[PDB]
Structure formats: C-alpha cells, structure tokens
Ligand binder design. Sequence first.
Ligand SMILES: Nc1ncnc2c1ncn2[C@@H]1O[C@H](COP(=O)(O)O)[C@@H](OP(=O)(O)O)[C@H]1O
Length: 282
Amino acid sequence: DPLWQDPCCDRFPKLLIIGPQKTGTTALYLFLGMHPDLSSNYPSSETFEEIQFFNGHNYHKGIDWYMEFFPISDFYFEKSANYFDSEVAPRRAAALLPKAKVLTILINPADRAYSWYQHQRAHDDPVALKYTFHEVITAGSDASSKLRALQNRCLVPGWYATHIERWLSAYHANQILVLDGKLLRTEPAKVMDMVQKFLGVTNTIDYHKTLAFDPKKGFWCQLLEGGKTKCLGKSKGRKYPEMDLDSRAFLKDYYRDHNIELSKLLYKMGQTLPTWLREDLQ
Ligand SMILES: Nc1ncnc2c1ncn2[C@@H]1O[C@H](COP(=O)(O)O)[C@@H](OP(=O)(O)O)[C@H]1O
C-alpha cells in the first residue's frame, strides 16, 4: 500500500463529495455540474459517475490513473459515496489533495438504511429480497452471515460522527461541509447556495430560478424550456412503501446516541445541525 504525495496540478479535483450512499449524492453531483465554472469527471464504464479511487483497490493504480478522469471551467470535483465510510480514504486523499474541499451529505440514518435496503432489492440482492427490512435491522442470533452482512451495510454507514471524525483528522474543519440531505431533496436551491458560498464561487447561480419540483417524479429536477424538466434516472428516487413505523421507532432508539454525538461534533465543526437531526433530538 502506497501513499501518493502532493505532486506540487491544475488537473486535480478541488472538491470531494464523499457520500455516504443514498443521501442524494448523485443529485448534488448533477446540479453542481450545471454551474458553468464547475466541472465533474468523465464517467467510468465500471463505476459510472463515481471514480472510487481512494477507497479500495483502484488506489494502487497511481496518480496518473486518477488524473485521466479529469479534463485537461477550472474547478473539478468527483463523487464517490464510498469515501465517507472508508477507513483509508481520508489520509490517502489528504496526502494527495491536501487543499481539497470535503463535502458530505446526511439524511436521517434510518431512512438512509432503508434506502440502501431498497437499493439492494432493486439490484435483486437475494438476502435483501429474502428478508424484510425489520428482519435485516434486527438480524440476530438466528441470522445468517449474509443477512448479518446486509445489516452492517444498512446500519454502520449511519454512524455519521464516527466516520466524520476520520475525515476531520485528515482535514481542517473549514475545508469540510456537512450538508442537510433533507434540505437538498426538499429545497435544493438552498443547499446549492451554501455549497457555492462554501466553494468560494465567484459568480453564484440561483437554482431556485432554474430547478423545479416535478410532482410525477416526486423530486426536484432541472428546469428546461417551457415547463419541461430533466430529472434523475429511474434508479434515483425509487418508488417503494413507506417504512414500517415499528422499524422506524426501533431505529430511532438505536441511533439516539450516535445522533447525540453527531450533534456535538457538527457544532464543534461549526456546521449547522440538519433539520432531520433537530427533530430526532427533540
Ligand atoms: N432531485 C432528486 N432526484 C432524485 N432523487 C433524489 C433527489 N434528491 C435527492 N434524491 C434522493 O437521493 C437518493 C439517492 O442517493 P445516492 O445518489 O446517494 O445513491 C434517492 O433514493 P431513494 O431511491 O431511496 O428515494 C432519493 O431519495
């Protein structure tokens, strides 16, 4: 395992959206790319919009492998929801891009866990298709290894504070931005504003004016000519049943403490507490 150091250049991302998954990363990624001054990486035929360099096996491929993803607009960014959870990504990223901006998006952990479950079912994951949500989150003494594994993938990434500390040890607080996932989905133009301000955007664009709520889609989309909308794909904003109330409550109890710690950490980081977080904490 190596540790690519800062080569200095201009062909490197200046912002990293580390996830986690199912928090609205693709939407932030899509809306940000709309700003004429900000440019995303080119898609991978294996990981699509994501690069996934710092997290796992792709990192030992070298710096040039990474640089190729970016154009040769003068501010690039990449998104890999796998970075948030990654243990090694923080220091590996800090070593190569010490001055990079780090952005993360948080939604209620319970819904984030539910979305992952629904996500694995959509991709026809057998363990996810075989067990119900409650069975996954309460997987126990009679639970299989695969079932247990799916539970970890639903719940662990939701220990927001734990992972944010790993990134906070590799990056200064003023180089990190914790977004409200609920606000991004409910009022995207509001967070698109905080992001721009956070990136030091010279010519701020108003998204209120050129985004729009698509009722048949149930989410915001890009406003085009004459009412028209360009929304995210079918795999984004999947149509499934509201999560069980008992399951919700069960998870509410489980994260209570994680959420207490998060509230303290963010405050200490100088980040505004997410709406969903204030409610859960009351
Ligand atoms: N404008 C938007 N259009 C579509 N989905 C959006 C959205 N803003 C937020 N989302 C949310 O972001 C999730 C996907 O996140 P990610 O890109 O990190 O995997 C969605 O999955 P759901 O399909 O479970 O509702 C959805 O709730």
